[PDB]
Amino acid sequence: KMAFTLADRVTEEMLADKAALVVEVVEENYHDAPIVGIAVVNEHGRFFLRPETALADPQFVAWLGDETKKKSMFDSKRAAVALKWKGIELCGVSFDLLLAAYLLDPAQGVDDVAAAAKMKQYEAVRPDEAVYGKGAKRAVPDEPVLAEHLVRKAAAIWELERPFLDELRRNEQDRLLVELEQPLSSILAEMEFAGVKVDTKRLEQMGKELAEQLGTVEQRIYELAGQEFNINSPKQLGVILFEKLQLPVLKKTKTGYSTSADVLEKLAPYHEIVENILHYRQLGKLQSTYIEGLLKVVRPATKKVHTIFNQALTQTGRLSSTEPNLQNIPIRLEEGRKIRQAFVPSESDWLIFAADYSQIELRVLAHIAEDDNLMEAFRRDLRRQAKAVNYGIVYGISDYGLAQNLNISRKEAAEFIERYFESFPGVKRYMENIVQEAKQKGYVTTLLHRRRYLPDITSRNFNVRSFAERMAMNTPIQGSAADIIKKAMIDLNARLKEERLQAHLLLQVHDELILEAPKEEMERLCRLVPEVMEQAVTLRVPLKVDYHYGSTWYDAK
DNA sequence: CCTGACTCC
DNA sequence: ATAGGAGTCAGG
Numbered sequence: 001k002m003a004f005t006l007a008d009r010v011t012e013e014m015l016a017d018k019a020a021l022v023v024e025v026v027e028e029n030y031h032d033a034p035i036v037g038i039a040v041v042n043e044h045g046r047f048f049l050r051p052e053t054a055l056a057d058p059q060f061v062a063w064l065g066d067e068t069k070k071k072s073m074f075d076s077k078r079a080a081v082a083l084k085w086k087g088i089e090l091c092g093v094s095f096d097l098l099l100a101a102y103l104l105d106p107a108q109g110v111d112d113v114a115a116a117a118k119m120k121q122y123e124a125v126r127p128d129e130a131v132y133g134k135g136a137k138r139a140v141p142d143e144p145v146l147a148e149h150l151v152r153k154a155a156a157i158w159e160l161e162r163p164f165l166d167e168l169r170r171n172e173q174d175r176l177l178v179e180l181e182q183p184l185s186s187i188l189a190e191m192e193f194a195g196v197k198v199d200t201k202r203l204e205q206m207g208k209e210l211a212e213q214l215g216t217v218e219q220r221i222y223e224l225a226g227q228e229f230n231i232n233s234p235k236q237l238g239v240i241l242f243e244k245l246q247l248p249v250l251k252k253t254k255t256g257y258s259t260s261a262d263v264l265e266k267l268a269p270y271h272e273i274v275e276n277i278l279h280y281r282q283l284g285k286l287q288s289t290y291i292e293g294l295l296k297v298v299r300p301a302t303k304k305v306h307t308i309f310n311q312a313l314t315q316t317g318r319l320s321s322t323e324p325n326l327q328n329i330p331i332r333l334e335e336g337r338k339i340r341q342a343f344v345p346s347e348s349d350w351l352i353f354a355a356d357y358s359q360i361e362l363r364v365l366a367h368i369a370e371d372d373n374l375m376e377a378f379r380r381d382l383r384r385q386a387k388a389v390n391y392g393i394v395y396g397i398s399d400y401g402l403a404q405n406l407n408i409s410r411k412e413a414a415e416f417i418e419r420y421f422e423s424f425p426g427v428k429r430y431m432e433n434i435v436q437e438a439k440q441k442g443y444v445t446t447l448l449h450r451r452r453y454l455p456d457i458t459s460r461n462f463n464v465r466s467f468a469e470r471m472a473m474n475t476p477i478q479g480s481a482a483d484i485i486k487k488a489m490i491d492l493n494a495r496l497k498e499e500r501l502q503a504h505l506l507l508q509v510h511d512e513l514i515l516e517a518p519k520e521e522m523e524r525l526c527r528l529v530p531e532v533m534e535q536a537v538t539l540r541v542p543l544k545v546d547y548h549y550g551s552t553w554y555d556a557k
Numbered sequence: 558c559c560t561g562a563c564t565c566c
Numbered sequence: 567a568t569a570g571g572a573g574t575c576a577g578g
């Protein structure tokens with residue numbers, strides 16, 4: 001039904017200057033993962049190649065690394081990184097079907113070729129899950145079955161390129177793919193493969209001291225409670241707090257009494273056990289996640305951790321970070337912040353450099369809402385609890401939420417919101433207009449033409465409709481800020497390279513960039529990094545970047 | 558596997 | 567009813 005050559009050796013007709021290429025890595029975490037199969041589709045035909053054969057072939061390897069030999073792929077970053085671990089360089093990726101699908105509509109959650117193919121009623125390819133199976137049942141099938149699947153995926157990519165590119169052009173999103181997301185993919189691949197070095201000696205010492213403190217807090221809690229119980233079970237905790245100790249029930253969820261941090265905080269005037277419990281649950285998360293969980297994913301020989309930045313997941317155009325997540329390392333409490341002392345440069349006499357956008361989404365909003373008062377404050381170039389309120393309000397917090405938030409009266413909360421929109425009447429207008437626009441069009445868009453569809457926005461159900469309306473208010477701002485830092489990464493890399501600096505990116509944290517570099521390059525970076533980030537886009541307001549460097553991530557403040 | 562914790566932006 | 571976007575963990 002689909003002819004292909006199950007090849008024993010690489011031939012010339014496989015090395016054309018345009019091809020759909022499949023380099024199959026079946027493990028979800030592709031760092032140092034096996035490549036199980038290769039497929040090439042071009043004008044000359046369809047081929048399957050065994051990886052041990054192809055990857056040890058000097059012409060095939062040469063062809064992968066040749067930028068002028070153009071490849072169309074699905075999830076090229078997965079392939080590029082897996083190939084780096086195999087010591088092979090991949091260049092010339094001209095079309096990425098995953099990223100194409102993602103821009104057309106991030107809600108499809110497209111995560112295999114079959115799911116992208118569905119968008120264009122192309123069905124001559126199976127889903128990966130159907131071929132490999134699930135969980136403990138997962139496995140690479142017999143070679144002829146595997147070969148047909150990889151070929152069918154290459155065929156699908158080969159025939160789907162033009163239809164996807166055609167639709168992107170119609171949406172005015174083709175430049176967003178080719179000039180932004182695709183180049184970013186290569187940059188992210190570099191960061192992931194580079195990894196971040198960890199001071200395991202220090203992290204393990206922190207872990208030993210944390211275990212002692214946990215024990216102390218745990219016993220204190222039992223004493224206060226008059227009983228032992230599992231503090232980490234909201235159910236058992238609920239019984240202690242609301243049945244044994246008879247504290248007021250302020251909130252319930254579908255499964256029982258709430259013990260959220262917000263609720264516990266409000267119960268502080270009733271019993272001191274709630275403050276101990278909050279402390280215990282912080283310490284316990286530090287241990288389970290940022291000591292134990294982090295140590296489990298350190299590569300022992302190099303002491304490096306290699307995250308995967310998911311570039312086609314969030315509904316707003318942000319990245320996410322997994323296994324481990326390096327975008328949520330503690331910072332707000334000194335006790336947790338000390339985890340950052342364990343993230344260190346990968347070479348001696350190198351340093352960590354961290355730069356952060358000031359008030360990014362408020363500046364973006366000022367530009368898009370063209371609010372004179374707000375654009376004014378930033379032209380005059382004018383706290384953690386305040387920041388949360390600022391963003392709360394512009395993004396549609398209610399009087400109830402703000403009151404519960406600042407533990408103030410609802411009346412007072414409602415007044416505050418009213419005066420906030422008086423200080424910034426353009427913002428208010430922008431938010432009423434953007435909702436009406438979303439209702440009329442069925443989607444909202446960002447500065448660089450990223451899109452999010454909101455089919456729920458005219459629901460008759462109040463809850464459903466309201467959530468969609470708040471997405472209409474937030475997505476263009478959060479998403480526009482995502483566009484800006486992404487452009488900034490691309491320009492920064494180019495500027496680092498031409499100036500032949502050794503500095504390279506390690507992490508992006510939504511509106512921060514983290515690099516490491518030889519100590520000699522700090523003065524140069526102090527100028528180069530903020531300049532490029534600030535000049536990424538030009539808005540009606542200024543972009544402002546704060547920066548710091550130090551011996552460890554902790555000290556880069 | 559889901560829920561409800563803690564963590565970040 | 568009750569700002570938005572994320573991931574990992576232990577418990578059940």
Ligand SMILES: Nc1ccn([C@H]2C[C@H](O)[C@@H](COP(=O)(O)OP(=O)(O)OP(=O)(O)O)O2)c(=O)n1
Pocket residue numbers: 169172173174175176177447448449
């Ligand atoms: N074919 C296109 C055209 C534009 N864009 C994206 C990337 C551009 O940086 C952004 C802005 O496009 P232009 O500045 O070229 O056009 P406008 O100035 O008119 O912007 P807009 O159409 O949003 O008003 O939109 C795109 O992805 N593909």
Ligand SMILES: Nc1ccn([C@H]2C[C@H](O)[C@@H](COP(=O)(O)OP(=O)(O)OP(=O)(O)O)O2)c(=O)n1
Pocket residue numbers: 356357358359360361362387388391510511566570
């Ligand atoms: N509670 C929060 C925190 C952050 N963000 C979003 C908006 C922020 O602008 C962006 C970046 O987070 P920051 O903490 O860096 O916020 P700022 O850039 O506004 O402040 P700063 O000047 O301190 O960097 O993420 C948000 O929506 N809600």
Ligand SMILES: [Mn+2]
Pocket residue numbers: 356357358359360511
């Ligand atoms: Mn910032």
